[PDB]
Design a protein around this ligand. Sequence first.
Ligand SMILES: O=C(N[C@@H]1CCCS(=O)(=O)C1)c1ccc(Oc2ccc(C#C[C@]3(O)CN4CCC3CC4)cc2)cc1
Ligand SMILES: O=C(N[C@@H]1CCCS(=O)(=O)C1)c1ccc(Oc2ccc(C#C[C@]3(O)CN4CCC3CC4)cc2)cc1
Ligand SMILES: O=C(N[C@H]1CCCS(=O)(=O)C1)c1ccc(Oc2ccc(C#C[C@]3(O)CN4CCC3CC4)cc2)cc1
Ligand SMILES: O=C(N[C@H]1CCCS(=O)(=O)C1)c1ccc(Oc2ccc(C#C[C@]3(O)CN4CCC3CC4)cc2)cc1
Ligand SMILES: [Ca+2]
Ligand SMILES: [Ca+2]
Ligand SMILES: [Ca+2]
Ligand SMILES: [Ca+2]
Ligand SMILES: [Ca+2]
Ligand SMILES: [Ca+2]
Ligand SMILES: [Ca+2]
Ligand SMILES: [Ca+2]
Ligand code: NA
Ligand code: NA
Ligand code: NA
Ligand code: NA
Ligand SMILES: [Zn+2]
Ligand SMILES: [Zn+2]
Ligand SMILES: [Zn+2]
Ligand SMILES: [Zn+2]
Ligand SMILES: [Zn+2]
Ligand SMILES: [Zn+2]
Ligand SMILES: [Zn+2]
Ligand SMILES: [Zn+2]
Lengths: 166, 169, 166, 169
Amino acid sequence: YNVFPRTLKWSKMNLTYRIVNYTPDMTHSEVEKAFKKAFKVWSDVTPLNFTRLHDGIADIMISFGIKEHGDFYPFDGPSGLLAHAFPPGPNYGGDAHFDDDETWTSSSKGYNLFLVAAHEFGHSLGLDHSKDPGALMFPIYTYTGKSHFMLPDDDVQGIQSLYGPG
Amino acid sequence: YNVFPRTLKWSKMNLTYRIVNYTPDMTHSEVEKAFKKAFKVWSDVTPLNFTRLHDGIADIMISFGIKEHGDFYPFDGPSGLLAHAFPPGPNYGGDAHFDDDETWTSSSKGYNLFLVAAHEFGHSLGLDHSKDPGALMFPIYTYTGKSHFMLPDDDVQGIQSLYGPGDED
Amino acid sequence: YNVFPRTLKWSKMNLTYRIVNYTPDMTHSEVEKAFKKAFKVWSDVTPLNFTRLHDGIADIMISFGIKEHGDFYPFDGPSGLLAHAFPPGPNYGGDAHFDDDETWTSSSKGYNLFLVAAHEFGHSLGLDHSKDPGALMFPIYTYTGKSHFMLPDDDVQGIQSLYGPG
Amino acid sequence: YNVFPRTLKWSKMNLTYRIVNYTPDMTHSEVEKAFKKAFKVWSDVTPLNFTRLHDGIADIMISFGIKEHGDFYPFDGPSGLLAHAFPPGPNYGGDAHFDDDETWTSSSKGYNLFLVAAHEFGHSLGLDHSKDPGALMFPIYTYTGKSHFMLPDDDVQGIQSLYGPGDED
Ligand SMILES: O=C(N[C@@H]1CCCS(=O)(=O)C1)c1ccc(Oc2ccc(C#C[C@]3(O)CN4CCC3CC4)cc2)cc1
Ligand SMILES: O=C(N[C@@H]1CCCS(=O)(=O)C1)c1ccc(Oc2ccc(C#C[C@]3(O)CN4CCC3CC4)cc2)cc1
Ligand SMILES: O=C(N[C@H]1CCCS(=O)(=O)C1)c1ccc(Oc2ccc(C#C[C@]3(O)CN4CCC3CC4)cc2)cc1
Ligand SMILES: O=C(N[C@H]1CCCS(=O)(=O)C1)c1ccc(Oc2ccc(C#C[C@]3(O)CN4CCC3CC4)cc2)cc1
Ligand SMILES: [Ca+2]
Ligand SMILES: [Ca+2]
Ligand SMILES: [Ca+2]
Ligand SMILES: [Ca+2]
Ligand SMILES: [Ca+2]
Ligand SMILES: [Ca+2]
Ligand SMILES: [Ca+2]
Ligand SMILES: [Ca+2]
Ligand code: NA
Ligand code: NA
Ligand code: NA
Ligand code: NA
Ligand SMILES: [Zn+2]
Ligand SMILES: [Zn+2]
Ligand SMILES: [Zn+2]
Ligand SMILES: [Zn+2]
Ligand SMILES: [Zn+2]
Ligand SMILES: [Zn+2]
Ligand SMILES: [Zn+2]
Ligand SMILES: [Zn+2]
């Protein structure tokens, strides 16, 4: 027999990402910074490193889309589903899509992109939803106003359980 | 925290299905009996339970379509791809699609719907194709009609590696 | 230059149809009768004839589907959009899809299939929406209880303006 | 009663568009200037009006995507198909898609976004490809950058056969 085995973790520590397109809501510079900072969340506590490619295929393809946007898991217009990502693996594995029917922001007016991305990249790297209500991997969006992100211990233990400490 | 599970499987034992639409080739009643039996192939041999829904969102959405019918697996007219099913997962996950350019039956003629459905529902549950030529999960159609259907050992081991044996008696 | 020319009418009077699949809500016999009767509406007042095929390609392919069902014009779950059809032409032209997230009926409990089909086949044959509130080609569903359908004069004039009288 | 119109065209002169997302290759501002100019190619020469929407449902939804991006017209990486647009109609009708595996510019380098958009928007409005090698609707990319853009006669005749000339002065 055969089952469908999942890829439980990336078998390499060095990963690439490509920002394929850009939301109307934020500057390219703001978007870029949000994603760089969201990857940093995970690289800061593991041996994982993240390199941005401008062209061609990277492990983690990032794009913004609305409704049916190419994977038959359509988004839903404003609110509800915010974004989704695929777990580790080839092709669509690791990739992240953000519903551009949301208003994305570098602060408080709409969804904070850094925080939603950081959550999504947890998925990209092998983490499911946490049941701990303080966790970044908890299913619900929270934005504290705080200018300095610290990754909650539950997420640190989760990611470390896959990759070890940095 | 939670890491994703080891294999694609359902994380709950109680599953629902919906017959979204029906083939011209057989009565509603024959289609329903075929699919009920196909699920029982798997429930008999694990702790899985299957309940039919008449409408709304079920885990396993069953439908009959031809050519482009809403995914990346277009059908191809008569013979060829008979049907396909998505592995366990949300939305399209677990769904089962049957090519209605085939002849579906409850006999030895055309393609026996019970047998192809039993096969497809292994995919819906987490089994890919087997290489064991006696396996129900073998990717080639073979008709048998034994009064008491026995699931081949290779399929019993595959499915129980995913969900365990359920009540062994 | 080129525009995209529409096919304004079928260039043949004899047309075929295929019922590809069947709703859960009605017997095959009931469904069959509804479609036969809905075609009859248009054949009764024009030289058009309709032949049912069981297999292969016919001019008017009839199927029931939910959500995304193969043409990127998805249905919408219960209520709202009931069905849609394509105007005359090859391939998808003439075809009719019915949203099987509606309850279809031979009477009053849910949508009367005969009446919605008859409307859809008006589209299949080259008619747009009527502005006359009594017309079968008016955009809004009405079901009178009446056991005997008579096609409103506005629709008779519309279809005849394309094909002539029977 | 109403028979369908003779050609695929918009049955209203006031049309809206939405820039759903943006290419990495150019600033928001450059992208907006390119598209505004592309629409003005057609509004200058018919009674058509185009208004930008910042969100929601517009007649013409513009977006940048790669490979499978939600239709039956997957992109193909660099060169090849540059972009495609649906003819006038509801939902996908009028929408314009640009392959972001191309290099989009506001110069002679890569593919000039203004020119490819001007071309695509003819499709969004009801023009198919022309055989006139000097036509904007010719299916092959050619760069010119004349300060005052003149729409070629073949494209003026095509578009006005659909919507008339608007104010001729
Ligand atoms: O789409 C989403 N949710 C649902 C999916 C199904 C459809 S639905 O249920 O409507 C929405 C979705 C929701 C949230 C999300 O990203 C998330 C998830 C959790 C957080 C968080 C948090 C914090 O408490 C706030 N700070 C202190 C502790 C911790 C970290 C920083 C932020 C973004 C990403 C996606
Ligand atoms: O889907 C539909 N409508 C909308 C489309 C956009 C989404 S929405 O606006 O929610 C619904 C739709 C609606 C209706 C429909 O079929 C129709 C349309 C009109 C009729 C009618 C009628 C009658 O008045 C009743 N009798 C006496 C005169 C005449 C004929 C017999 C019946 C079915 C077919 C499709
Ligand atoms: O679509 C199908 N396969 C290919 C078609 C060609 C195009 S493709 O090559 O992509 C896939 C397809 C789909 C479903 C199928 O269902 C199947 C698969 C296997 C069987 C079987 C069998 C037995 O040998 C007969 N009995 C004794 C032992 C076992 C069990 C009972 C029956 C139906 C079989 C084939
Ligand atoms: O995708 C495209 N075409 C093919 C690519 C190969 C795959 S395919 O063969 O399917 C289609 C494609 C898409 C958009 C294009 O935009 C176009 C099309 C034509 C032009 C032009 C031109 C001129 O000659 C230059 N100037 C003087 C006269 C005219 C007008 C101004 C510019 C952009 C051009 C090509
Ligand atoms: Ca990937
Ligand atoms: Ca949303
Ligand atoms: Ca087939
Ligand atoms: Ca499912
Ligand atoms: Ca057809
Ligand atoms: Ca509906
Ligand atoms: Ca390309
Ligand atoms: Ca549109
Ligand atoms: Na947005
Ligand atoms: Na069939
Ligand atoms: Na139904
Ligand atoms: Na690009
Ligand atoms: Zn997606
Ligand atoms: Zn999540
Ligand atoms: Zn399918
Ligand atoms: Zn199979
Ligand atoms: Zn359809
Ligand atoms: Zn209608
Ligand atoms: Zn496209
Ligand atoms: Zn073109």
